[PDB]
Symmetry: C2
Subunit: 594 residues, 2 copies
């Protein structure tokens, strides 16, 4: 357990992946979402002493051949003996031996293994030499991207060195590294090295199970790049993956050069990521531009959280290939309705169930204003689905409008012939009565934006809202006394604080006669309640006091706290009453500039 | 100072570099080795209130043109007005404005500025449009490596986004980012954008001050790659840099294709590193393979700790160029004696002062075994320099022997005709009597290794060392009684513990007669003091007990603690007495297996 020169051999629970480390720093944490079991023993070569803690004694080093046995690579040792490599790695020189573990030899195909045992003089010797370098190279010398000639026919050894400490040779991970030998060093790797493929393109053209992906590739003029030099990571979708897609989707993406090209580039990484370098979740930029999330669940590689990898670490002269169960479809290749996620299903179901999905033609460009599922109450879903169909028609535009194109005062046109006002604030974008959330996406033929509430375009003007309610009567009269009816009737952008008749019943009529004598003070007192521009409370950043200049001249202060709108530190009763030419906030008492 | 919505404008002491941040996380630390001065004020748009801390009030947003004034870019505002760009950035649409600061316009060349003021209708408008994007892009949207078309002739804007948070456009750093406008966003940049060069190669061919580097480039066949697409960082050495080198060095490197090619690739980075992204020291891999250290002292860019950059941020369609005062010479292009550093100067002076430097021919391959300066005592430097010349001749090999080629039992041949034994241990490599330190380097025509002590090849065998000292007399007799003289005379590798005559004077002769009757126990008792192989105490790892198998059979335990060799927990008097065929450790009393 505790002591000097103690080594821990961990194994991820539920897998065969083993990680061998010294006890210098704590290495204990979940790997690939799973805990590990640990085996403590003296690091190879070190020994225990009586009455002492740990392993304070050490044995002398041996030659490379004996070090094969010191590290437990007894099968590699036997094969080294049978091929007469033993006498070379016992003599003069300095050698690096990437020795496959015993389990690595057990995992090798039986026909290949028997083929090696039947030709020990040449083929077996050439394979073991393929596992070797004619110089001593520690793991700190095996830099990422190095191509080091081996000891057989100068065959290239492709080194990868990752920030997490994983060192791979032809994607074979080094389990036990840096066992010093009198004439070299031994590193125990997790698989037997094999002949690398010619290139990724050549593997695609050769493999029949990648026929579909090949065709698409040749259609997208991207297969040529996968044959040139480089260090790519390709997530190749098999023919099963293409069969999984809905009908016509593959035909639709293939019929369009842009969607097909983006679809192809979305599977390719510009760097080499061996499977054994994945110890957790990370994001990687694809050639399409957008990223994919690569992770691991036990010994299963996950792509975008899906355990879709079935065959991994297909190494080739220009990078690695991992076969996957599904096709990776980037947003830039999806139809607009396909851009929605979980919290929009209701919306996307409704527009499908009420006959609007067919109106989103592939040759058109559209914008979906999708409310979250929480925005559809039972009372809303209980209305007649024709009215609900009109409402949904207020959430679809026949023009693609990206989030980066919206501006204050912009007017959007729904497919239902209605107009939507865009209000841009410092920290929020609100369309009519609904404000945007995060999660906007752009696709092949449109964009989608997520909203907290259902968008309901206003139907009454300020004047109609004022005269339809009785509690505003007196105030309305004053507004008409100031010749503001034409303002409250014509289109525009205003913010009006409407004091109820209760505020004037705090004046009790007499002060309305005292104010009636003033044909000028009513202009100030009344005009202070009006402000140019539409300022809704749910568009503010919470807690911050907004200083606005009313049309009267003096300042007014609006603060949104706990979903309540305060005006001059006075809690308003009703707020965000939308009209066609402004917004109304109902206040309890009168407002003065002070 | 403290409060919400407070912004800090820092300036690196001694420079003009300003960094504008909000007070969300502590941003206060030295940048480029210098402290900063800080200016606290409400973030633009926010206001203070009576009796409140910080800036809890806010003003409404404005259009892009007014936001130019809100952020202090009043000169950009004036130029926008004079070119009639103002009415466009006040109207419909969504714009990103990379507004140069007032200081940025002051730094612009006066002739170019006056040329813009004399053609406001087209040229000035086209430049300001070159500073703009026709969509709203926050800094989080300006991903690294993006080439975003501007609003003039679709001119490319080269985005770089660094892990430290620095965002640059054509290497112009964004000082104040993300000022939201009703119709866009304003980012204040630190310089006026100019037309990017055609390519790095074209700038090299055009610039006369890079004539030398051009020639070398054309000689190394690397100038073609600097004209193809990419994102390179080139540290171009001027003709002054080449003039600085010693005589013939440039001719020597140019006459060799390998040294010239490595010399050229050592100046080139595979990624784009704008100067304003450098806030501290970091290492970068060059195209040659080895790394360079890039840092900053105030506003001076440092390369390998030298303030050699004089003109920086020469942006071109395929990367950035920084002109430097010196030539970057990688180890792979240096003669072997040029590989030594500070702690080897004495050595490199000696071999030069005693006439050995000329023997290191460029067409030969050599290995220097350089002791540190601390290894040359005054008594050593006081010997006749001819003996010292022989000693130095024991530190030079006429064959290149890399550190990764040394193996246990190897015999090296000095230029003085002497032989050096290589002893490889688990954690140390010792040559004869001296053990290696870190810092081995490889060059054009040799390698260098650093040693703690002067290498003195042994001259006497075990037998000669035994008979030349009287305190060993008795023991020597016993060794000759066991027929070991031929072993102590012939070459080999042994470790002998020699008990002095004081140990046998603890037996007082009589026990030598009691042992004299035993013609077999003397074989065990004597042979226990001998061990196959050479084990010197300074080759051990400190504190660890080395378990060795003596030639008698039983185990012996050697531990090096506080530069003292303990054998079976017995402090030895003298240790590491080197002989031609072994090593001697003088013990106080006899040794028994026990
Ligand atoms: Ca052995
Ligand atoms: Ca390492
Ligand atoms: Ca192991
Ligand atoms: Ca094409
Ligand atoms: Ca989702
Ligand atoms: Ca507004
Ligand atoms: Ca203005
Ligand atoms: Ca950012
Ligand atoms: Ca500023
Ligand atoms: Ca060439
Ligand atoms: Ca140095
Ligand atoms: Ca030895
Ligand atoms: Cl470790
Ligand atoms: Cl954990
Ligand atoms: Cl053990
Ligand atoms: Cl055997
Ligand atoms: Cl690891
Ligand atoms: Cl390792
Ligand atoms: Cl070694
Ligand atoms: Cl990871
Ligand atoms: Cl994770
Ligand atoms: Cl239907
Ligand atoms: Cl219906
Ligand atoms: Cl876009
Ligand atoms: Cl309207
Ligand atoms: Cl916003
Ligand atoms: Cl109503
Ligand atoms: Cl005021
Ligand atoms: Cl910030
Ligand atoms: Cl500091
Ligand atoms: Cl202030
Ligand atoms: Cl003006
Ligand atoms: Cl920063
Ligand atoms: Cl910033
Ligand atoms: Cl905006
Ligand atoms: Cl940095
Ligand atoms: Cl630093
Ligand atoms: Cl001389
Ligand atoms: Cl001399
Ligand atoms: Cl090398
Ligand atoms: Cl010898
Ligand atoms: Cl070593
Ligand atoms: Cl002597
Ligand atoms: Cl024993
Ligand atoms: Mg094995
Ligand atoms: Mg690899
Ligand atoms: Mg396929
Ligand atoms: Mg792997
Ligand atoms: Mg929904
Ligand atoms: Mg938003
Ligand atoms: Mg009223
Ligand atoms: Mg509100
Ligand atoms: Mg300015
Ligand atoms: Mg840039
Ligand atoms: Mg030059
Ligand atoms: Mg810069
Ligand atoms: Mg020296
Ligand atoms: Mg060493
Ligand atoms: Mg004696
Ligand atoms: Mg010692
Ligand atoms: Na606001
Ligand atoms: Na040792
Ligand atoms: Zn205002
Ligand atoms: Zn031994």
């Amino acid at each position: 357990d505790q002591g000097p020169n103690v080594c821990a051999l961990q194994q991820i629970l539920g897998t065969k992946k083993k990680y061998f480390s010294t006890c210098k720093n704590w290495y204990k944490k979940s790997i690939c979402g799973q805990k590990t079991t640990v085996l403590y023993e003296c690091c190879p070569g070190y020994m225990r002493m009586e009455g002492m803690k740990g392993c304070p004694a050490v044995l002398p080093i041996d030659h490379v051949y004996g070090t094969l046995g010191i590290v437990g690579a007894t099968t590699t040792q036997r094969y080294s003996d049978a091929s007469k490599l033993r006498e070379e790695i016992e003599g003069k020189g300095s050698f690096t031996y990437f020795a496959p573990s015993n389990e690595a030899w057990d995992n090798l195909d039986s026909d290949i293994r028997r083929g090696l045992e039947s030709n020990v003089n040449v083929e077996l010797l050439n394979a073991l030499h393929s596992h070797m370098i004619n110089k001593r190279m520690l793991t700190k010398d095996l830099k990422n991207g190095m191509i080091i000639p081996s000891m057989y026919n100068n065959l290239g050894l492709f080194i990868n060195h990752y920030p997490n400490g994983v060192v791979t040779v032809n994607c074979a991970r080094i389990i036990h590294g840096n066992q010093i030998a009198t004439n070299g060093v031994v590193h125990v790797i997790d698989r037997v090295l094999t002949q690398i493929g010619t290139s990724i393109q050549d593997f695609i053209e050769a493999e029949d199970d990648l026929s579909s992906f090949r065709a698409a590739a040749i259609t997208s003029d991207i297969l040529e790049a996968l044959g040139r030099d480089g260090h790519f990571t390709l997530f190749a979708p098999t023919n099963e993956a293409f069969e999984k897609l809905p009908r016509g989707v593959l035909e639709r993406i293939m019929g369009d050069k842009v969607a097909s090209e983006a679809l192809m580039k979305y599977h390719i990484l510009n760097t080499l990521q061996c499977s054994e370098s994945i110890m957790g979740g990370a994001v990687f930029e694809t050639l399409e531009g957008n990223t994919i999330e690569i992770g691991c669940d036990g010994d299963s590689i996950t792509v975008n959280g899906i355990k879709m990898v079935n065959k991994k670490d297909i190494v080739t002269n220009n990078g690695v290939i991992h076969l996957i169960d599904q096709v990776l479809i980037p947003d830039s290749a999806k139809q607009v309705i396909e851009l929605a996620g979980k919290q929009q299903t209701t919306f996307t179901d409704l527009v499908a169930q009420l006959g609007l999905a067919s109106a989103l033609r592939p040759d058109g460009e559209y914008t979906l204003l999708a409310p979250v599922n929480n925005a559809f109450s039972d009372d809303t879903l209980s209305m007649d689905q024709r009215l609900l169909k009109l409402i949904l028609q207020n959430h679809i535009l026949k023009v693609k409008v990206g989030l980066n194109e919206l501006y204050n005062g912009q007017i959007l046109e729904t497919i239902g012939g209605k107009q939507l006002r865009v209000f841009v604030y410092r920290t929020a974008v609100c369309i009519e009565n609904s404000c945007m959330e995060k999660g906007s996406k752009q696709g092949r033929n449109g964009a989608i934006h997520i909203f907290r509430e259902i968008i309901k375009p206003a139907e009454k003007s300020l004047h109609e809202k004022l005269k339809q309610d009785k509690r505003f009567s007196t105030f309305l009269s004053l507004l008409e006394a100031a010749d503001l009816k034409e303002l409250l009737t014509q289109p525009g952008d205003w913010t009006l604080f409407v004091p109820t008749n209760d505020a004037f019943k705090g004046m009790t009529s007499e002060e309305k006669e005292i104010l009636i004598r003033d044909k000028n003070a009513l202009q100030n007192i009344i005009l202070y309640h009006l402000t140019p521009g539409v300022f809704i409370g749910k568009g503010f950043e919470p807690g911050v006091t907004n200083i606005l200049k009313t049309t009267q001249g003096s300042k007014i202060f609006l603060k949104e706290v706990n979903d309540t709108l305060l005006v001059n530190e006075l809690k308003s009763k009703e707020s965000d009453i939308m009209t066609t030419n402004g917004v109304i906030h109902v206040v309890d008492k009168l407002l003065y500039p002070a």
